[PDB]
Design a protein around this ligand. Structure first.
Ligand code: BNG
Length: 447
């Protein structure tokens, strides 16, 4: 466990990037929108329509996920064909070409470049949800493999908290320095783009995929200071027993077969339950939502949501090993439904009672807290237990496809639905939260 941390850490750097680019565009929205609306006027000799600006900026945050879906679709392709590290490494090209397209959308005078770079860094982020946990989950000793996949999660949530903090009016969330905010990705990226060639090609890859018995044999002795493991080698050839003794069923079979048509119904819904709960609304729009409430200095309440989120991600790890699977998923769903009620109250009585600005903050803090213990981790956990070593991969691509899809819908349409619907938006998310809650009570089993 010496040279190992180098490889693990450099990998997670890309889960950080996932953490950033996701929770970035939520603190400096009206700053770019001012860029949007001014750009429009100069160009088209006409001023921007409010709804235009809305769907336009909606697409800038949304088109991220169109990207990530494709990214997560293409994950299997690069991994097997190129190894894990040679993929992490080469995909930094995506990180750089998007960093440039956004951070020079400044004198570019083009919000296309901004949306495009958002797409591309969506692809990069889609691909990276697959590369990272994989790599970390072959490199690590099987014992420490549990406590170390922890870093892909943590990487994201911390990655988020940074996007928010860097987002401050006083850092890079301001009329002058928001392209360096959207671009500073490169400083993480180039770092990994340097660390990585010092990092080892996956042993389960050199042995099973690349069929190098001796070249793979050599990686571990470095990767493990004083282990030199016959146990790891027999495991890799027993992992290539069970993962290769049950046929890798394709996604396309999952659907055609009635045997699977039900387990797959559950896994998928669980993903809708995660995104259609309405979180990325509080993580794409935290600041705009806190404003409209009555919050003064809304980005701090955003970073409030940042800290609380990271806090309960760590608390979840403990509670997750302890309790049932749909225990946490229910309690999690519950609080979130009730918090989205507190919200719609605050957002409602705000006008008669000022300090509901505060109730907004309370609502959402416990609402993201309640999230990370429940619908956060549980719908992933359940798929790995709803499918054996054979249909399990096919199962994950569909899961991840629901996740990137219900994500696009919240991101693209949450602004649609805050205008036409007012301080009741969280009653939409409360009606879902209930439905979902109900669904899991009668249809999803313990695991
Ligand atoms: C055993 C595997 C466990 C998987 C752990 C998942 C941890 C929860 C992370 O979920 C993510 O939370 C973000 C905010 O925290 C959202 O922006 C994002 O859309 C959502 O997907």
């Amino acid at each position: 466990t010496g040279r190992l941390m180098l490889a693990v850490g450099g990998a997670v750097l890309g889960s950080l990037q996932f953490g950033y680019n996701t929770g970035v565009i939520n603190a400096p929205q009206k700053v770019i929108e001012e860029f949007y609306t001014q750009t429009w006027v100069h160009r088209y000799g006409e001023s921007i329509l409010p709804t235009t600006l809305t769907t336009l900026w909606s697409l800038s945050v949304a088109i991220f996920s169109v990207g990530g879906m494709i990214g997560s679709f293409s994950v299997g392709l690069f991994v097997n064909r190129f190894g894990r590290r040679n993929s992490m490494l080469m995909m930094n090209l995506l990180a750089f070409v998007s960093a440039v397209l956004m951070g020079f959308s400044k004198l570019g005078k083009s919000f296309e470049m901004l949306i495009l770079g958002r797409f591309i860094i969506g692809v990069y982020c889609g691909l990276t949800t697959g590369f990272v946990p994989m790599y970390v989950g072959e490199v690590s000793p099987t014992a420490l493999r549990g406590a170390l996949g922890t870093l892909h999660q943590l990487g994201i949530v911390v990655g988020i908290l940074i996007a928010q903090v860097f987002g401050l009016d006083s850092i890079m969330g301001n009329k002058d320095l928001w392209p360096l905010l959207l671009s500073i990705i490169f400083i993480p990226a180039l770092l990994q783009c340097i660390v990585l060639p010092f990092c080892p090609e996956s042993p389960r890859f050199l042995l099973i995929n690349r069929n190098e018995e001796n070249r793979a044999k050599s990686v571990l002795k470095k990767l493990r200071g004083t282990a030199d493991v016959t146990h790891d080698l027999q495991e890799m050839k027993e992992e290539s027993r069970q993962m290769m003794r049950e046929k890798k069923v394709t996604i396309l079979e999952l659907f055609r077969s009635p045997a699977y048509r039900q387990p797959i119904l559950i896994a998928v819904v669980l993903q809708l339950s995660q995104q259609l709960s309405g979180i990325n609304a509080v993580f794409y729009y935290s600041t705009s939502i806190f404003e409209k409430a009555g919050v003064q200095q809304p980005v701090y309440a955003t970073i409030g949501s940042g800290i609380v989120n990271t806090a309960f991600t760590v608390v979840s790890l403990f509670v997750v090993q302890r309790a049932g699977r749909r225990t946490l998923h229910l309690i999690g769903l519950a609080g979130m439904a009730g918090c989205a009620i507190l919200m719609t109250i605050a957002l409602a009585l705000l006008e008669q009672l000022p300090w509901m600005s505060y109730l907004s903050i309370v609502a959402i803090f416990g609402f993201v807290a309640f999230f990370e213990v429940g619908p956060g981790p549980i719908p992933w956990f359940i798929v790995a237990e709803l499918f054996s070593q054979g249909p399990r991969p096919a199962a994950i691509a569909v899961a991840g496809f629901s996740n990137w899809t219900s994500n696009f819908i919240v991101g693209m349409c949450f602004q649609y639905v805050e205008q036409l619907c007012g301080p009741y938006v969280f009653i939409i998310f409360t009606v879902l939260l209930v439905l979902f809650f109900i669904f899991t009570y009668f249809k999803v089993p313990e695991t």
